[PDB]
């Protein structure tokens, strides 16, 4: 059987989206609730919003933004035109907040139901929509991500740890430059990495939870995935023992690398997806690889946690919108019999109250 469950949700092509616009810089999915595509239809630009609850009725509107991003939970949209930023509540046809940066934002994304992170060439800001706020520089950019192409920005739950990921071509390979910032200690740490995500985990015998930082990389050592506790264990907690495994790359995937990570606090499992469509399932706790396989033949360029199931949902250059999640019905039997890992099996059942 399969420890995971695959599922196609859409074919943006069938909706009339030009495959040209089905890429990183024109198609955004800040949540599994909406997908925005930017198209040049005639001599006029415009954004197509697709409400995942009603795919068939994409709404089109004229924009002049060089970038658009939907709030993870509402028809509230961020639009940027150079150094000019505007937030609109589509249903209320109103301009909520506006701001004019001193520098161009080269990347930005929602990181909470109400905060927008902005990344300029040499700094990172947070912008709450709460009240009359404005953008607040969280930290300056490390020189290691200088000249990189910014591709991601994540936060731990308490927004105490910040991760900015860049990538570039070096020695004929895609090298991943990460910047891990501590909000408390005001200190940044360079880390070679491609994809990563944070996660809350309550180790047995701990009153409080550990704040984990998981990240995958294909460095010269080949491919590895680390799981470490970040920060100081809560007074009283034992510390979380750092984990490090091997992420396999077959010989056909020669330049393929990690591109997205989503962790399900539900099953405590890490979903990792490579640039060219591979999918890996590791146990968050032990880092034991539980499953791997091809899921997309066309490259993936954006994902988001897939709420309903606690899996990961993404889009490939083809327009297909897939999603993988834990197959609650047989993740245990699989581990037990196919992997012959009775221990991991008995653990995952008891741990996340399954079977």
């Amino acid at each position: 059987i399969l420890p995971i469950r695959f599922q196609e949700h859409l074919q943006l092509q069938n909706l009339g989206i030009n495959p040209a616009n089905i890429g990183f810089s024109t198609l955004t999915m800040e949540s599994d609730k909406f997908i925005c595509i930017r198209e040049k239809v005639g001599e006029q630009a415009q954004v197509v919003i697709i409400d995942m609850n009603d795919p068939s009725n994409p709404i089109r509107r004229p924009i002049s933004a060089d970038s658009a991003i939907m709030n993870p939970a509402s028809k509230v949209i961020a639009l940027k035109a150079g150094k000019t930023l505007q937030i609109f509540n589509i249903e209320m046809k109103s301009k909520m907040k506006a701001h004019t940066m001193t520098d161009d934002v080269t990347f930005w994304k929602w990181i909470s139901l109400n905060t927008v992170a902005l990344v300029t060439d040499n700094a990172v800001y947070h912008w709450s929509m709460e009240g009359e706020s404005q953008p607040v520089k969280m930290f300056d950019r490390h020189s290691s991500l200088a000249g990189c192409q910014i591709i991601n920005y994540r936060t731990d739950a308490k927004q105490k740890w910040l991760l900015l990921t860049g990538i570039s071509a070096q020695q004929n390979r895609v090298v991943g430059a990460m910047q891990l910032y501590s909000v408390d200690r005001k200190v940044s740490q360079p880390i070679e990495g491609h994809a990563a995500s944070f996660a809350q985990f309550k180790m047995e015998g701990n009153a409080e939870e550990s704040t984990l930082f998981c990240f995958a990389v294909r460095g010269q050592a080949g491919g590895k995935l680390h799981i470490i506790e970040v920060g100081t264990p809560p007074t009283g907690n034992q510390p979380f023992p750092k984990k490090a495994v091997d992420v396999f790359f077959p010989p056909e995937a020669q330049n393929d690398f990690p591109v997205a990570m989503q962790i399900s606090e539900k099953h405590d499992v890490v979903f990792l997806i490579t640039k060219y469509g591979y999918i890996h399932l590791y146990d968050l706790e032990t880092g034991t690889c539980i499953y791997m396989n091809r899921i997309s033949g066309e490259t993936i360029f954006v994902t988001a946690p897939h709420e309903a199931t606690a899996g990961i949902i993404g889009v490939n250059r083809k327009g297909q919108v897939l999603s993988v999640c834990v197959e609650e019905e047989n993740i245990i039997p699989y581990i037990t019999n196919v992997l012959q890992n009775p221990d991991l099996a008995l653990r995952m059942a008891v741990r996340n109250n399954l079977a």
Binding site: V47, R61, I63, A65, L79, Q86, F88, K93, K95
Partner: peptide, 7 residues
């Protein structure tokens, strides 16, 4: 400056 025509 409206970056979004919405009506």
């Amino acid at each position: 400056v409206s970056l979004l025509d919405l009506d």
